[PDB]
Each structure stands twice: as C-alpha cells, then as structure tokens.
C-alpha cells in the first residue's frame, strides 16, 4: 500500500470507519463482499454485491437453488443482461463505465452514469457522501489504479463509506487477493476516475445505484 492510502487492515481504517458518519453501506456491503473471479471480472463482483444489497429480483439457477442470489457465476443468466455485452467478451477484456450502467440497468434497477468529464470534485464528493448516508443508494466507483498509487489499470469497486475528518473514501475493493479494502483521499481518487479509459475513449467516474 503506497503511504497515500489508509488499508481498511489497520487501526487507522478501522477507526475512519468508526469516526465515519456516512457509512450506511458499509453494513450491506460488507455482508455481500465477494472475491472477483478475474480481474476481467471487478465489475461483475461490484454489480453483484449491490444488487444483492438491493434484494432485488435475483437469478434463480441450480447453483443455489431453491435460493435466489446474484453471484458472478449467473450473473448473465438474465437475457437482457447478456444482449448488453457477451460474458466472452467481459470475461476477457471487462467492462466500460458505460457498459457497468447498462449491465446493472438489464436487471430493472434506477442507474446514473456520471463520467468525471461531466462532473468536479466538489460535486462528486458532495453527491456519493450524500448517497452513503442514504439505504438503497449505491455507489460503483471506475478509476485507474495507478493514479491512486496501486498497481496498474482501470478498476471497478463499490464505495462502502466516507470519512469527513480526512476527507476519504471507502473502497470495497474486490481484488480480495491483491488488495484490501483502502481509504482514498478524494482528490486522488477523483484523479483517478479522471482518466480516459482507452476501450471506451471515455473518462472514467462513477454510477448510482438504487
Ligand atoms: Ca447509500
């Protein structure tokens, strides 16, 4: 972890989280958390766990069944969903921000695409600190890695809560294996997310979910 981070494994995030007074999501995060299968896959392990957090219509395959719950595995059971973009081809090469939208949009859930490019810092902070306050709102963030000191490309990761006192942000990081959850300073997240991603030829940023 690059000293600009605060690891969630540590005294000092344990206590960002416990000083945090927009941290409603956490709860419903932390109990949904998932292991992304791949890289390729960060986005699927994010839609999942908020979709799960939502108890929306969930898939009903053999995996789990007589249970319904959104897992990476059926996530593309929905017809829908898969009209969107291939599994293949997500399963390789993973998904845009645009494309995130329209894969949690497939399952009849409300979905706000917000590119930085069209939005500032002082509106993102304010909106998703907002939002982590609120039950039924969620928050996906898409940034690269490497702008906030981590390593290497575009990422995909809910946001669990915010910490006023030091202005970061939680991120549910679904890389499990590689990293743990991070509090991330807002300007370098929102450089992060402030980026051009080269599959879409689009800024990166964020998307609410309810
Ligand atoms: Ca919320």
């Not at 927009?22 to 979709?51: H, K, W």
């Not at 897992?71 to 390789?92: G, H, L, Y």
């Not at 090469?93 to 409300?110: F, H, N, P, W």
């Given at each position: 972890?690059?000293?600009?981070?605060?690891?969630?494994?540590?005294?000092?995030?344990?206590?960002?989280?416990?000083?945090?007074?927009?941290?409603?999501d956490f709860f419903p995060l932390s109990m949904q958390f998932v292991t992304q299968v791949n890289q390729?896959?960060?986005?699927?392990?994010?839609?999942?766990?908020?979709?799960?957090?939502?108890?929306?219509?969930?898939?009903?395959?053999?995996?789990?069944?007589?249970?319904?719950?959104?897992?990476?595995?059926?996530?593309?059971?929905?017809?829908?969903?898969?009209?969107?973009?291939?599994?293949?081809?997500?399963?390789?090469?993973?998904?845009?921000?645009?494309?995130?939208?329209?894969?949690?949009?497939?399952?009849?859930?409300?979905?706000?695409?917000?590119?930085?490019?069209?939005?500032?810092?002082?509106?993102?902070?304010?909106?998703?600190?907002?939002?982590?306050?609120?039950?039924?709102?969620?928050?996906?963030?898409?940034?690269?890695?490497?702008?906030?000191?981590?390593?290497?490309?575009?990422?995909?990761?809910?946001?669990?809560?915010?910490?006023?006192?030091?202005?970061?942000?939680?991120?549910?990081?679904?890389?499990?294996?590689?990293?743990?959850?991070?509090?991330?300073?807002?300007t370098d997240l929102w450089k992060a997310m402030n980026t051009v991603d080269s599959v879409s030829q689009?800024?990166?940023?964020?998307?609410?979910?309810?």
């Amino acid at each position: 972890l690059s000293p600009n981070l605060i690891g969630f494994n540590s005294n000092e995030g344990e206590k960002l989280l416990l000083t945090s007074r927009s941290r409603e999501d956490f709860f419903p995060l932390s109990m949904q958390f998932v292991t992304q299968v791949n890289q390729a896959y960060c986005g699927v392990a994010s839609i999942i766990m908020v979709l799960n957090s939502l108890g929306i219509n969930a898939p009903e395959t053999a995996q789990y069944s007589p249970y319904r719950v959104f897992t990476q595995d059926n996530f593309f059971s929905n017809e829908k969903t898969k009209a969107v973009i291939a599994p293949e081809v997500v399963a390789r090469q993973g998904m845009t921000l645009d494309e995130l939208g329209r894969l949690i949009a497939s399952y009849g859930v409300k979905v706000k695409v917000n590119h930085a490019s069209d939005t500032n810092i002082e509106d993102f902070r304010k909106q998703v600190a907002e939002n982590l306050k609120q039950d039924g709102n969620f928050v996906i963030v898409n940034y690269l890695r490497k702008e906030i000191g981590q390593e290497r490309g575009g990422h995909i990761s809910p946001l669990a809560a915010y910490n006023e006192q030091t202005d970061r942000f939680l991120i549910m990081d679904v890389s499990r294996y590689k990293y743990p959850p991070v509090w991330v300073k807002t300007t370098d997240l929102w450089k992060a997310m402030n980026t051009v991603d080269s599959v879409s030829q689009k800024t990166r940023g964020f998307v609410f979910v309810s």
